[PDB]
Design a protein around this nucleic acid. Structure first.
Ligand SMILES: [Mg+2]
Ligand SMILES: [Mg+2]
Ligand SMILES: [Mg+2]
Ligand SMILES: [Mg+2]
Ligand SMILES: [Mg+2]
Ligand SMILES: [Mg+2]
Ligand SMILES: [Mg+2]
Ligand SMILES: [Mg+2]
Ligand SMILES: [Mg+2]
Ligand SMILES: [Mg+2]
Ligand SMILES: [Mg+2]
Ligand SMILES: [Mg+2]
Ligand SMILES: [Mg+2]
Ligand SMILES: [Mg+2]
Ligand SMILES: [Mg+2]
Ligand SMILES: [Mg+2]
Ligand SMILES: [Mg+2]
Ligand SMILES: [Mg+2]
Ligand SMILES: [Mg+2]
Ligand SMILES: [Mg+2]
Ligand SMILES: [Mg+2]
Ligand SMILES: [Mg+2]
Ligand SMILES: [Mg+2]
Ligand SMILES: [Mg+2]
Ligand SMILES: [Mg+2]
Ligand SMILES: [Mg+2]
Ligand SMILES: [Mg+2]
Ligand SMILES: [Mg+2]
Ligand SMILES: [Mg+2]
Ligand SMILES: [Mg+2]
Ligand SMILES: [Mg+2]
Ligand SMILES: [Mg+2]
Ligand SMILES: [Mg+2]
Ligand SMILES: [Mg+2]
Ligand SMILES: [Mg+2]
Ligand SMILES: [Mg+2]
Ligand SMILES: [Mg+2]
Ligand SMILES: [Mg+2]
Ligand SMILES: [Mg+2]
Ligand SMILES: [Mg+2]
Ligand SMILES: [Mg+2]
Ligand SMILES: [Mg+2]
Ligand SMILES: [Mg+2]
Ligand SMILES: [Mg+2]
Ligand SMILES: [Mg+2]
Ligand SMILES: [Mg+2]
Ligand SMILES: [Mg+2]
Ligand SMILES: [Mg+2]
Lengths: 129, 141, 149
RNA sequence: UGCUUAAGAUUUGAAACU
RNA sequence: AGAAGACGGUCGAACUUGACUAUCUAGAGGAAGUAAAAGUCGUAACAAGGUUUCCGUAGGUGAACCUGCGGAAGGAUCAUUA
RNA sequence: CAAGUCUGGUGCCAGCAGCCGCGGUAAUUCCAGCUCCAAUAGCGUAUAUUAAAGUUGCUGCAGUUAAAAAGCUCGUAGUUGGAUCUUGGGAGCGGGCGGCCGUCCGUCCCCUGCCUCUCGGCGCCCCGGGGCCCGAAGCGUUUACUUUGAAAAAAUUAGAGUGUUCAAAGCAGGCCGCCUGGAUACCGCAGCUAGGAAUAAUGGAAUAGGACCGCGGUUCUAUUUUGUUGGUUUUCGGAACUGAGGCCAUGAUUAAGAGGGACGGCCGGGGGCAUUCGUAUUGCGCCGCUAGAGGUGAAAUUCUUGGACCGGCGCAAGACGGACCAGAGCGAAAGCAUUUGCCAAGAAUGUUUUCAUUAAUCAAGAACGAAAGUCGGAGGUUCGAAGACGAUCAGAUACCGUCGUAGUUCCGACCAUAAACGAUGCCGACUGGCGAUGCGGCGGCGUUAUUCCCAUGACCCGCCGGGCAGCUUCCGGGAAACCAAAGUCUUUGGGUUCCGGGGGGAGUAUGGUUGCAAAGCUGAAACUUAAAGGAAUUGACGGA
RNA sequence: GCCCUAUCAACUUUCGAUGGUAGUCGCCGUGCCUACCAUGGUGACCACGGGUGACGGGGAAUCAGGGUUCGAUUCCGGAGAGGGAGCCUGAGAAACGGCUACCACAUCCAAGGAAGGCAGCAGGCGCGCAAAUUACCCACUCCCGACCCGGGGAGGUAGUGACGA
RNA sequence: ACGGCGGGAGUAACUAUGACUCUCUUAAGGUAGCCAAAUGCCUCGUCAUCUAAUUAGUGACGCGCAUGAAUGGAUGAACG
RNA sequence: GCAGCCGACUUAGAACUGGUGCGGACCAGGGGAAUCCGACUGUUUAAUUAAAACAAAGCAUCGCGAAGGC
C-alpha cells in the first residue's frame, strides 16, 4: 500500500505529460503536497489548481501547462548540509541554470537558491524541472 | 539495490559481505588456500635443481615438440615443469644444476600452445642465459 | 488487500457529506437512549442494534443525533460484555471447527483454516493488551476456550 | 495397407583512400 | 646489634599421567577426474535423425542406452464445423 | 600499435608470439645481413597491486528464453507504516503595473512564558502606595535534524613570499650600522555550549483519583520579638492528611476507492463422511451349430471335437464414471465429474451497521505437498517394470506379438522430490480503445409460460464491481522474438523478501543433520580451458 | 569509535560468575581478596568460541563525485630483551650493557671449579628471489655530573649505493 | 530337487600385463561379491606397519593345486 | 495459624581430637585396543570331548476336500 502519497502523486503527474494531458486528479491532500504545488506555482510551471473538500483526505484537480518536463520524488528522505547540496545538484539536474531541488527546513519548505539566502539546510523532499 | 531505507545498514553490509566471496579474483588472492598451495608461496622467483630434460608436444594446428625441464624446488620440495625459451639452449643444461625459475606471465595459466606449463627459466648456474646464448659470456668450466 | 485470502474486493457502505439530521425524525436524543437500554437489556449486539434502528425506527447514524456512538454509550452504564463481539465469534468459529476436526481426522482443509483463525486471534489479543481492555494474563488456551463460551 | 536402409581420418581464405 | 638454621603459610616456574587449532609422512590403489594432430567396438543426439525429444522416480543391460507409472512443449497441432 | 611485401638460408622440421595467428620447397611474423621505428643514460621480462570495472553496483548492475524468483501459504524478531492541531499585524527604503489611497513586489526590523501581587527591584515613565516600561542573577518536561561558538600535537598535503646561476628543496635575506620575514586555510564519527520547531517519533480527562479558586478540620517545623530568661499560646507562614463546593463553551478529531467483524439472498467437478445407479471387462454355468479362432507389414509360440471362437439367457467379482465437457467455474498449490443425505468452512457483490490503525513484507521455527518408492494389514478385474518365449536384424540383451510376477485399488504409519512452467516473487497504484464470456447487483421495448397478475422463470438492449481470457495499436520499452506489462529507467530512488558473477571440475569431497531404507537439506578447493551459450538473416541439406 | 568466519547458537556460576554487609592488603576508589546471605548477569541490535602472512594512530600511492588498497619503518603513546616465575637499592624499575633459580642453547679448566645473553654500532654464520665500512671525531645539535674545563659507536662527517627523484 | 559351472593366443599407434577379442568343440562356461582366511601344494608367497631381532598377528595385492551364493554368499550392536 | 501431652527412626551441615589410620576382621567385579565362528536364553557324549555341534524364532518349498493324506 501507499507509504508515500507525495511519491504516488509526482508519478501520477509524470504519466500525464508523456501522454500529453491537460488536467488531472490526485486522491490524497497533504499539507506537504499543497506547499509543494504552491512552490511550483510561484515559478509558473503549472496553472492554478484547486482542492475538493469532503470530510476525508480531500482531492485535488491540477491544470497543466506545457513547460513541465519531469517532476520527481526522492525516497528515502535525507539530511543535506551546505556542502552536500552542491554534490546533489552536481548530479541530479541537467544544468546549473534551471531545475529546483526542494527541501524542508525548520524555517519552512523552500528551494535551494533560497536556502543559500537564509543560510539554512534540512531534509530533502524531491526535485522538479 | 532493492531495499532503500534509512537505517538498513546491517542488511546491506551483511549482504555485500557475503556476495563478495563469489568473486574469483577476490577469492584466489585474498583469504583462502591459494597462497597456501602456491609452489612459490607468494613470491616472484624460485631456485631449483634440475633432475630431467623432457619434451612436450604442441597442441592443435601446430605440430612440434617444445622443450621442458623437470625441476625440484629448494624451499618446499615440489616439482615443476619449466620451459627453455630460446633455440637450442637445452644443450647448455647439464644434470643436477641450479636454475632460477620465473613465472611465465599469464598469472599461473596455460599459454599459447603448450599444455599446462606455468614457469620458465631465466638463469642457469648463476650465468644469465641471454649472454650464454648470445656470446657475451661463457659457461664456467 | 485481504489478510488470508487473495481477494481484492470493494464493497462497503458510503456515508454522504451531509452529517446533519433529518426532519421527520422527532425522536429525542435520550428516547433513543431508552430504546437502546431496552434492546441491549434484552440482549443484542451493538451492530444488530444499528440495524434494527434503521429498519424499524428510521435513523441513519446514531452519532449524528446523539453525542457518542453505541458501545461508548453502553460503556457509561455497564451493559457491555468484557470480550468484544468479533472476538466472540472467532472463538465460536474456532470451536465449531476444532469439533469438526475431532470427529473428522482426514479433513485437511479445516485443518488448514484452523491455523489462520488462530493467527487472527493471537494477532488481535495483542492489540487489546496494549489498548488495555484486557488483563495481561488473558490467553487463548486451545483446549479450554470452550469454557469461555 | 507402415518391413531393413550401418558407416566416411588431420590439417589448411585474407581487402585502401585518393 | 646480630652469622648460620629450622616449623608452617604464601608467590610459584618445572616434572610423570587426560581433551582442542593448524602442519606432515607410506600412502593402498580401490576409486576417481581432467588433458594429450590420426587406435578398437558400436550408433544414442541435431532434419518426423529414421521408436518425437527432455525432467522427476524405481528396475535392468558389454557401451552409449532400454522399458514402466503421473508431467511439460524448450514440438511436427495457436484451428476441424449440426 | 609507430615502422620493409629488401636479399640469402630451413621447409609443420628448429622456433616466435601477452591475444587472434606464422612454419608442409618463392615465409613481409623463424635464424642472419641490409634498412626502419619508439623511448635515451636508461630500457625490457616476472609478481604484488589501483584506475579502466555501471564485470561487486549506497551514487550506478541483473533475475521469461543466455548464469538467475524458494512448490505453496502461515509466522516471531527485523525493516517500513494513511489523513488531522495557527491563521497573522505594524515600522521603514529601492522600485513600476495604474487614476494622494494604491492594486504593491523585493528586503530588514518589531509585536515566546514568568519561578521573578519569594529572587531584588538598575534605570525609567505613573499617582509614603504599590507601580509602569526593562540590563541579570538561577529550571523553564524531551531526542531525532539543522546553523553558530569554544576546543582541537607537529611534520605532510594544498598554498603566499624569496631569484640555491634555474629546478626538486631550504626559510632566509635586501639596501647604505638599517629594514623585515618565518603567514593562512583546512581538521568528519561522538561530548560541552547557543538559537532554530517543517518533517519524523512519543505524551493528557472517558472505572473522571481532572485543573484550577476559596471556606472547615487533624500531625508538623525554623527563627525575631512579650527586658535579661524558663513551660505554655499564637500571629505570621512553609509540610502533609481531610469535609462540603463554585467554576471552564467543562473533556472522546474524521470514519481511508486501508483493514477486521456482523447480517442478507444466492452461487461452484471446493473439502470430509455415508447412500445409490450404470453399461462394459474378465470369469462361471446351462443350451444353440460347427473347423477354425487370435494376431502382425508378412508369420509363428498360443487355444481348440473333454466343443474354443461367435449368439441368447442368467450369475459373481473389482476397477473405472465417455458421449454431455468449452481457451467455462472453484481451490493457498498439488488438485477436484454417477444420484441422494448430513457436518462446518470460504470468495464476490449489497449495506446511510459495528470497532477506529488493529496493517504490508518477512530471518529462526511450522501445516499441506501428483506420480513412483518402503514396512504392515485386507482386496486382487484389467493393464504391467523384472522374466521366459516367437519373429525381425550382420548382432537386439530394443521398438513388434502371445504369457506374466512386483505394483496398479482400499484403510494405517512414513518419505518432501518434478519442465511443481506463465520456464515471468508478493502489496500499491498509475497511463488507449474495441468486441465477448461467467457470479451478484441496477433499469428497460417487447415475446414466453403461471392465467387470475403484481411477482418469480427463459430470451433481448444497456450500467457497475472483480475473475480466467481474446483481437487490434508507433503509449513505452527491448539484443530481438515479443509485452496494457517484461511500461512509467542516465529525465536513473514507491515499500519489502530470496538468489546469480565465465565455462567445466560439481551439486562432487568432507563435516554436520532429518529418515527404517532408498535419499534429501547446507556445501568448498585443488587443477584445467578461450570459448561454451541466447535471438534473428542467407545458403546447402530432410527416409517432412 | 575497528578486520574474516554461524561447517562456532546459547554462555557464565560453590574453581568469584553478577550484587549486599564488615574487614584484610595496597599510594587511593572497587570481589583485588577472605567471612556471611541472596540467584542472578550478557545474547540474532551476532553473545560465546576459532583464525589472522593483525602491532595501533598521525599518514602514503590512485582518484571526477563516491570510494578501494597500503600504513614493519626516523614524530607521539604502549608492549619485550632466549623462554617463563621471583626480589633487592632507590623518589621512580618486577629493570636485564644489575642480581636469584628452572628449561633450551652454550664457554675456560691442572677435572678441585669458574663464568655467560648483539631484537646497542660495525662485522661474520645461517636462512634466502631478497638488503653496505670490523673506518674517523666531539667541532656542530644536545645530554648527563660535585660541574665553564672531563665524557657520549646517542650523534656527525666520509666509504659502499642505478631504491628512487 | 541331488548336483555342474574348462579350452583353443593375441588382437593398437615403442615397454607391454594386455584393447577388443581371438574363437567354438562334447548341455550352459564362475556374474554380484570375499581371501594365503578354520578352505592356497609351491610357501616362511610379495609390499607396508607392529619388535633391539618376529615361520605367528593386523592391512593390502590375486595368477584361487582345490573360494562363491538357501550343498548359502557377503554383513554387525549385545552375549560367550 | 496457638498451648499440652506421648513417639519412633533416618538424612544433611559444622567443631574438636588421634604416629596418614579409619569398608581396619568377615564379606567382596583386574582392565583396554582388534580378528575368526555362532545371533542371544537354553540342551547333550551319567564315568576322558560342554564347543565353532543339534535345537530354536524367522524365511521357503511339497502332497491332501474324508471311501481321503500321512
Ligand atoms: Mg540504489
Ligand atoms: Mg589458445
Ligand atoms: Mg499481513
Ligand atoms: Mg592417424
Ligand atoms: Mg540422437
Ligand atoms: Mg517419432
Ligand atoms: Mg529418442
Ligand atoms: Mg531397456
Ligand atoms: Mg513397455
Ligand atoms: Mg521444444
Ligand atoms: Mg607492441
Ligand atoms: Mg586488479
Ligand atoms: Mg552483469
Ligand atoms: Mg537458465
Ligand atoms: Mg522454480
Ligand atoms: Mg524446488
Ligand atoms: Mg593531537
Ligand atoms: Mg507522527
Ligand atoms: Mg456419465
Ligand atoms: Mg527458512
Ligand atoms: Mg505397499
Ligand atoms: Mg503383465
Ligand atoms: Mg532385449
Ligand atoms: Mg502406491
Ligand atoms: Mg504414505
Ligand atoms: Mg513465497
Ligand atoms: Mg564461476
Ligand atoms: Mg558457448
Ligand atoms: Mg603504537
Ligand atoms: Mg565512484
Ligand atoms: Mg576497492
Ligand atoms: Mg614514547
Ligand atoms: Mg626478581
Ligand atoms: Mg620489569
Ligand atoms: Mg651489558
Ligand atoms: Mg643466549
Ligand atoms: Mg630484533
Ligand atoms: Mg660531558
Ligand atoms: Mg646511542
Ligand atoms: Mg654517489
Ligand atoms: Mg572373481
Ligand atoms: Mg587381520
Ligand atoms: Mg566351487
Ligand atoms: Mg541364501
Ligand atoms: Mg577381521
Ligand atoms: Mg548358549
Ligand atoms: Mg559325559
Ligand atoms: Mg568334561
Amino acid at each position: 500500500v501507499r507509504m508515500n502519497v507525495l511519491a504516488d502523486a509526482l508519478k501520477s503527474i509524470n504519466n500525464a505529460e508523456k501522454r500529453g494531458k491537460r488536467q488531472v486528479l490526485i486522491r490524497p491532500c497533504s499539507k506537504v503536497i499543497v506547499r509543494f504545488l504552491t512552490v511550483m506555482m510561484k515559478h509558473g510551471y503549472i496553472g492554478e489548481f484547486e482542492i475538493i473538500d469532503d470530510h476525508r483526505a480531500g482531492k485535488i484537480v491540477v491544470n497543466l501547462t506545457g513547460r513541465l518536463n519531469k517532476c520527481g520524488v526522492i525516497s528515502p528522505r535525507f539530511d543535506v548540509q551546505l556542502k552536500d547540496l552542491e554534490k546533489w545538484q552536481n548530479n541530479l539536474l541537467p544544468s546549473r541554470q534551471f531545475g529546483f531541488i526542494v527541501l524542508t527546513t525548520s524555517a519552512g519548505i523552500m528551494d535551494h537558491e533560497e536556502a543559500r539566502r537564509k543560510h539554512t539546510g534540512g531534509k530533502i523532499l524531491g526535485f522538479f524541472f | 539495490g532493492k531495499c532503500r531505507g534509512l537505517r538498513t545498514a546491517r542488511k546491506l553490509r551483511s549482504h555485500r559481505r557475503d556476495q563478495k566471496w563469489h568473486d574469483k579474483q577476490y577469492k584466489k588472492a585474498h583469504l583462502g588456500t591459494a597462497l597456501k598451495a602456491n609452489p612459490f608461496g607468494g613470491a616472484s622467483h624460485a631456485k631449483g635443481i634440475v633432475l630431467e630434460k623432457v619434451g612436450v608436444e604442441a597442441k592443435q594446428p601446430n605440430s612440434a615438440i617444445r622443450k621442458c625441464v623437470r625441476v625440484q624446488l629448494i624451499k618446499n620440495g615440489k616439482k615443476i615443469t619449466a620451459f627453455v625459451p630460446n633455440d637450442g639452449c637445452l644443450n647448455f643444461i647439464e644434470e643436477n644444476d641450479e636454475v632460477l625459475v620465473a613465472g611465465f606471465g599469464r598469472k599461473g595459466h596455460a599459454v599459447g600452445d603448450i599444455p599446462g606449463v606455468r614457469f620458465k627459466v631465466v638463469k642457469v648456474a648463476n650465468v644469465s642465459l641471454l649472454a650464454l646464448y648470445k656470446g657475451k659470456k661463457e659457461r664456467p668450466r | 488487500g485481504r489478510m488470508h485470502a487473495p481477494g481484492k474486493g470493494l464493497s462497503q457502505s458510503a456515508l454522504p457529506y451531509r452529517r446533519s439530521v433529518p426532519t421527520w425524525l422527532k425522536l429525542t436524543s435520550d428516547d433513543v437512549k431508552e430504546q437502546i437500554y431496552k434492546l441491549a437489556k434484552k440482549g443484542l449486539t451493538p451492530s444488530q442494534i444499528g440495524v434494527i434502528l434503521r429498519d424499524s425506527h428510521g435513523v441513519a447514524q446514531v452519532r449524528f443525533v446523539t453525542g457518542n456512538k453505541i458501545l461508548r454509550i453502553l460503556k457509561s452504564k455497564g451493559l457491555a460484555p468484557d470480550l468484544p463481539e468479533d472476538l466472540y465469534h472467532l472463538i465460536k468459529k474456532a470451536v465449531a471447527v476444532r469439533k469438526h476436526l475431532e470427529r473428522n481426522r482426514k479433513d485437511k482443509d479445516a485443518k488448514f483454516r484452523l491455523i489462520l483463525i488462530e493467527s487472527r486471534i493471537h494477532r488481535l489479543a495483542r492489540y487489546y493488551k496494549t489498548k488495555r481492555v484486557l488483563p495481561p494474563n488473558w490467553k487463548y488456551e486451545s483446549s479450554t476456550a470452550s469454557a469461555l463460551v
